[PDB]
Amino acid sequence: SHIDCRMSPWSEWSQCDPCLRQMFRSRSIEVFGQFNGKRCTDAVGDRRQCVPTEPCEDAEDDCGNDFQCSTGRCIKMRLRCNGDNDCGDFSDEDDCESEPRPPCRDRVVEESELARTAGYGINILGMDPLSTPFDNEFYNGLCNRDRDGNTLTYYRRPWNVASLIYETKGEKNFRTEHYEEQIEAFKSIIQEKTSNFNAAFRFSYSKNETYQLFLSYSSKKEKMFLHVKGEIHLGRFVMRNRDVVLTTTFVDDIKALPTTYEKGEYFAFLETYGTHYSSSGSLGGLYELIYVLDKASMKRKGVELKDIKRCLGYHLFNKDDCVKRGEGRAVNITSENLIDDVVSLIRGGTRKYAFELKEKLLRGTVIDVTDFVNWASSINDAPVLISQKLSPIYNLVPVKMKNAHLKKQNLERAIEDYINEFSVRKCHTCQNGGTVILMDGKCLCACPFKFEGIACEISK
Amino acid sequence: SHIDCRMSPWSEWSQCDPCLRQMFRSRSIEVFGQFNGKRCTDAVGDRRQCVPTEPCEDAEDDCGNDFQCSTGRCIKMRLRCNGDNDCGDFSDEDDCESEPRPPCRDRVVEESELARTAGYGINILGMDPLSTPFDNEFYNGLCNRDRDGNTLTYYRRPWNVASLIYETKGEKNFRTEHYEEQIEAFKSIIQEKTSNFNAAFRFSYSKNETYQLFLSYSSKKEKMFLHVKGEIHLGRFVMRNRDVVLTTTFVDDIKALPTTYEKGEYFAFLETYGTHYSSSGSLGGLYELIYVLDKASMKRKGVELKDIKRCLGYHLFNKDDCVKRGEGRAVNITSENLIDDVVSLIRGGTRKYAFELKEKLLRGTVIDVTDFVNWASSINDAPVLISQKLSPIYNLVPVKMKNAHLKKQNLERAIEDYINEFSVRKCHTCQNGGTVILMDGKCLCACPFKFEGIACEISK
Amino acid sequence: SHIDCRMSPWSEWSQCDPCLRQMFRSRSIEVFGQFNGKRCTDAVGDRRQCVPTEPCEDAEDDCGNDFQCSTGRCIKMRLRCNGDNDCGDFSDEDDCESEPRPPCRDRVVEESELARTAGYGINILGMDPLSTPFDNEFYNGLCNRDRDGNTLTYYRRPWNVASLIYETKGEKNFRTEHYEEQIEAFKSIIQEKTSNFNAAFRFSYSKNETYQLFLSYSSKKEKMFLHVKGEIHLGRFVMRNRDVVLTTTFVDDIKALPTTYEKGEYFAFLETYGTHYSSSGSLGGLYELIYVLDKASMKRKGVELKDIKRCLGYHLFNKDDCVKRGEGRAVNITSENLIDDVVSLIRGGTRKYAFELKEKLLRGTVIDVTDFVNWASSINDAPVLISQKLSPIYNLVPVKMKNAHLKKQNLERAIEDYINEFSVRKCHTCQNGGTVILMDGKCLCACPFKFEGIACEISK
Ligand SMILES: *[C@@H]1O[C@H](CO)[C@@H](O)[C@H](O)[C@H]1NC(C)=O
Ligand SMILES: *[C@@H]1O[C@H](CO)[C@@H](O)[C@H](O)[C@H]1NC(C)=O
Ligand SMILES: *[C@@H]1O[C@H](CO)[C@@H](O)[C@H](O)[C@H]1NC(C)=O
Ligand SMILES: *[C@@H]1O[C@H](CO)[C@@H](O)[C@H](O)[C@@H]1O
Ligand SMILES: *[C@@H]1O[C@H](CO)[C@@H](O)[C@H](O)[C@@H]1O
Ligand SMILES: *[C@@H]1O[C@H](CO)[C@@H](O)[C@H](O)[C@@H]1O
């Protein structure tokens, strides 16, 4: 068992991209390292400076009949001096001596806590970088209020969020399964022959053979299961799809794409800003217990016994003898296996109450209803995204910018190449029911419940 | 078992839509991914910028004999300086030095809490984005009061809400079913033959065969069920159908539709603003317990026994022998299955009392009547929509705007295409009673009560 | 089992209605969706803008010798400066410098709480939108007092209410039925033959056959029922039929009817303002318990037994044998079903006492007489309509307006078409006693007490 990492050879140098003065080249990954071998360490993509031999046109947008700002975002004239940071670099609340004319008037209006990070541009592994391509500070001069249940406030709705409810949806699943199987097998045998021959001046011949045999098999098995899962949802959100504003640090990174399907830059872009964006989330976070017991007793026995009681004797003078032989054997074999797994997981909430709750779960005693309530009041402060409906990031690249369809054509294939080349289906699978897991480019396998070996080979 | 996602090829590029300068093209989805395969990730619809080769007419409404505003909504002259935000951008309470003449006079008149979000533009999955196409701030210079039971106030009726009652309709269902079936089968057999032959100088021949057999089968079964469901309704609402005002961020998105049935834009519109709007809701929210027990004991036995007691002996001299043989067998097999499911769900109410109530339900002890009362007083703050009578969103697109019937003809087919192409009837169904569920474009199946496999195959 | 929704094809485009500049067309619904199929979603009626090719006359009323107002209601000269909002837009208390001359003088006179919403324009489903076609602010310069029992005040009688009493009519029904049936059947059989034949040097032949049989059947059944129903009535009302004033937002919607029996607009009108108006109601609200128990025990047994005891033996030398055989069988089968349903419902009253009362009902303990009294004092605040005598809405369209009889001829057939096309008698009925219920255009069936299937097929 010895597998090492591998690399494909590099490709050819494509072209000096004239709008970036760099030629790119790339390669792929054949086989990731496995079974205590060398790690691949993500060495795809390469860059090299070159002089532009044939210069491109000046790639800048027209920004027709709109006030250009000091960032690159083009806003309208209606957003002038509105008291809202619309250009990004505060190009409204400085210029004029006119009225600030706030569209949210003297009504009690605050800033939100859930809508401001409403992108959660997610990656296909499952973890979510908050590198939001959206900009949740652009209000576009509107004042739409969305109520809160507990605090009785009036939060705002940013322009990129199309809907934002605050329900209170608590939901506890609970299961406990139980299996048991006893079996007691049993087999006894007793045999006996007693032969006696007598002549008549005589001759005798006796034999008393007494065989016995005995076998038991008293084996039980047991297999429990338990599963608590209590979700707590506080609302949701749904993002938009047309006339969407993007943040400042993202339009530039789309504008710096090599436009010719150069493979090196897109694998950096898709891990800087994620693969998909959560177009419809649901905040508030869960907890979970799992209690997998397992038991396997076994007995087996054997009780064996033999006897021969011979004799002889005759009067003619006298002669006699008496012979005895007796053997006994016994075997007891009592085996036992026992396994207990406990897993607990808990997401969301303040640091002080959630880790009271986790240990009150794992103690096994009953939890008085003051810690789940305190954690559920805590979850308003620190929400954790729990369920999302994805959407690809090339459904977000704007069309106003130059070479938009070519960059979308690049990003629609880069996601296929990213999901293919880092897939788990390149490492050869582990035997004995071992589930292979790609991690750090090093396919580690998890063995079920009995196998301590890396290849799930050694048993107990 | 290995299914991956599939895609149809793209269509042809239709036409530069001259009023939007973009040509659209699209495709469909053949088979969603299933059984631990690649996800489809919603890649329908495509956009591309193009120069308008043949320009359209200037698509703007006439707004005949009405005061146009700084949003696009056309109000009447009666709404001038009324002290109500009718244009959306406050084009009443700024202009004149005349009287504000409030139609709600010095009577105690407030703003509502249930009517202001009275659209709940819903989607066919079951969840409800609050992206209200209606505008519940337009009062049209009228003062219609609707009373409250508990607080004794006088809320208003916005123009888009046609009726709004506040009942107090509490309604608890409760069920508990119970099934049980014991059975005890039993079968015993005893056999015996005793033969004895004697001559007469003699010869004997004996045999004592003693067979026995014994079988039990003592199996019981049990299957409980419980179901609490206590709804609490606080009123309802019924929206209108003619002379309806729409919000500012929705008439623009209808005006930006490609008018030629271009499939890419309508699938973004129908998931920005939902598929249907709740034309008749009922607020106030439920809770629910479900307690599905299951039990299956089983015993079976077997007790077997054999015996042969032969003999022989004669005087002529003497000879005799006595032979004994005896076998015994026993099997006990005692199996047991047990399953407990508990589900609890709770909607509506403040964060502090509802999650006291849920754990007081799941404890199993009796709940003193102070937590259901406190949750029911809490439900006035945070209502949750509970029952609705839908209506399609192409019964809402106004007819005053240009190309209204063509856009309604597009939206009446886009709902059929949306309900067909994301239907569950494309994924091949799971066996063993597994109910397939479309989720994230990845058809996951739920297996009933015994099957841990993805295809519901492995049993216990 | 697979039924989907269906639609008839659309009709022909009728005519540009010249007073509304819109041609209408429509269709019908053949079969609603049923058994987990596609929903119809109410797609009847259609509108389309068209230029008026032949213009109609200016549809406005004469309003002969009456002061026209700024709404469209024509009041008399006697109502000038009376201090009552008669035109709707306050065209009395602004103009003159004369006396306000209130017809209710310095006597203690208030505004009502039950008469102000005295329409309750109801729909044929059973639920009641408060979209009152009547106007319960028009007093017509009269001062008619109607007393109150508890508060000792003097409420007013609006012109649309012809009579208004405040009784106090409490009425509790109570039932408890009980059925029980035990039966114990029993059948035992014992048989025996003992034959013995002896010769005489001999020969014997014996036989002792001993059969037995035993059967029980000890099954009981029980079926309880309980039904509390305590109504509490506080008064009633009776509306008028001639010289009736209607509200401002209803004469316009009658005036916007297409006049040619165009089917699309009337199905929106009849669900904006209901099908009938409650011409004679009775306020104050009920509560209700239902306790349906069900039990079905069953036993059955069987105890079977057989025996053959043969023998033979003769002296001639000697020979004999003895043969025994004995079988035993036993079956016990003990089945049990149990069902408990509880339903509770409660209408009317403040939020704090009614939901104390509901849980004091469902606890099963006796309720001390302090919660029913507090709920009955609460019911003065929040009444709920409980019994009504309907009347069709085309007995309410005024005759002064133009094309009144044609619109009444349209509305007298639109109610027949509405009650026919959304009737439950289009969905094919469910078997096994399943009652079909039309809901959301999706005929769901309810199965009685044992059947969990959608088509009431699977039993227990
Ligand atoms: C994958 O690994 C897990 C780890 O415990 C194991 O339980 C499971 O049986 C493996 N196989 C599959 C198909 O999930
Ligand atoms: C669908 O899945 C559920 C999940 O438990 C199962 O109970 C049910 O039998 C399945 N089939 C149908 C027809 O609902
Ligand atoms: C209708 O459905 C109900 C639901 O329980 C059932 O009790 C009744 O027998 C059905 N049939 C009729 C004729 O009411
Ligand atoms: C990467 O590219 C270099 C270019 O010189 C090769 O030499 C190397 O073997 C690898 O393919
Ligand atoms: C989408 O459309 C492109 C257009 O070039 C095709 O090449 C592709 O195969 C897919 O159909
Ligand atoms: C509705 O009416 C249209 C009119 O073109 C038909 O094409 C359609 O089939 C339905 O009947």
Residue numbers in the entry:
A (entry chain B), B (entry chain A), C (entry chain V): 18 to 217, 249 to 364, 379 to 522
Sentences from the paper on this structure:
To address this question, we determined the 2.2 Å X-ray crystal structure of monomeric murine C9 together with the 3.9 Å resolution cryo EM structure of poly-C9.
Further, and in regards to the remarkable 88 stranded β-barrel itself, our data were of sufficient quality to reveal individual strands within the assembly, providing experimental evidence that the β-barrel adopts the S = n/2 architecture as predicted by bioinformatics analysis. Six of these interactions involve the TSP1 domain, which plays an important role in pore assembly and is intercalated around the outer edge of the ring. A comparison to the polyC9 structure with the monomeric C9 form revealed that TMH1 must move to expose the elongation face for an additional C9 monomer to bind to the growing assembly. In polyC9, however, both TMH1 and TMH2 are released and, as a consequence, the HTH region has moved such that it partially occupies the position vacated by TMH2.
